[PDB]
Amino acid sequence: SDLQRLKFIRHARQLGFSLESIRELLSIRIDPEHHTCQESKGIVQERLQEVEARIAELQSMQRSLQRLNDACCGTAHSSVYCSILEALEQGASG
Amino acid sequence: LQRLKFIRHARQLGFSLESIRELLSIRIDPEHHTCQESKGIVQERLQEVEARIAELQSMQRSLQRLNDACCGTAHSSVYCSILEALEQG
Ligand SMILES: [Mg+2]
Ligand SMILES: [Zn+2]
Ligand SMILES: [Zn+2]
Ligand SMILES: [Zn+2]
Ligand SMILES: [Zn+2]
Numbered sequence: 001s002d003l004q005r006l007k008f009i010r011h012a013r014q015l016g017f018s019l020e021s022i023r024e025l026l027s028i029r030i031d032p033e034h035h036t037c038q039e040s041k042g043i044v045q046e047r048l049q050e051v052e053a054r055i056a057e058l059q060s061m062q063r064s065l066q067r068l069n070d071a072c073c074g075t076a077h078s079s080v081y082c083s084i085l086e087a088l089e090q091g092a093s094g
Numbered sequence: 095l096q097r098l099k100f101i102r103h104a105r106q107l108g109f110s111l112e113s114i115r116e117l118l119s120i121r122i123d124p125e126h127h128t129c130q131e132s133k134g135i136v137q138e139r140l141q142e143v144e145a146r147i148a149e150l151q152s153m154q155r156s157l158q159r160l161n162d163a164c165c166g167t168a169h170s171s172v173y174c175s176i177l178e179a180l181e182q183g
Pocket of ligand 1: 081
């Protein structure tokens with residue numbers, strides 16, 4: 001139905017599939033007899049790898065930011081002594 | 095060259111232009127700023143990063159499940175579990 005098609009698209013968009021990938025998934029959807037699991041899995045797996053890569057990138061930043069946070073007292077203490085500034089002057093490892 | 099190095103490091107952590115601007119002001123006039131200010135800027139960015147990680151991990155878990163159930167071979171997509179899952183959500 002029209003509602004089911006939108007539901008299909010909605011679910012794919014919720015997983016972050018690109019316009020290109022959703023178009024391909026839709027093509028498979030209405031013409032499955034001429035497509036395979038290798039094609040559908042490839043679409044999913046490529047998106048999966050991009051998501052995991054982005055998570056790892058963010059986690060690296062998360063760890064550095066966490067280290068920056070943890071070393072600072074976070075009070076009225078004069079910034080002339082702030083470890084955050086010292087760290088950023090040296091690098092981005094936190 | 096140091097100001098540019100500082101900015102580079104801040105950029106590597108994803109700080110916004112606004113946050114970098116605030117950090118630079120603290121850096122140049124530290125005697126009139128506090129650790130509370132610098133830590134707040136760090137926490138705002140850290141929380142933004144953690145929020146995005148959480149959103150992505152949610153997608154990752156679902157995608158991983160879709161991946162694992164499919165044979166990924168010449169098997170006709172008429173039987174594909176990925177398409178079935180997408181229909182259901
Ligand atoms: Mg110290
Ligand atoms: Zn302090
Ligand atoms: Zn500090
Ligand atoms: Zn299969
Ligand atoms: Zn399949």
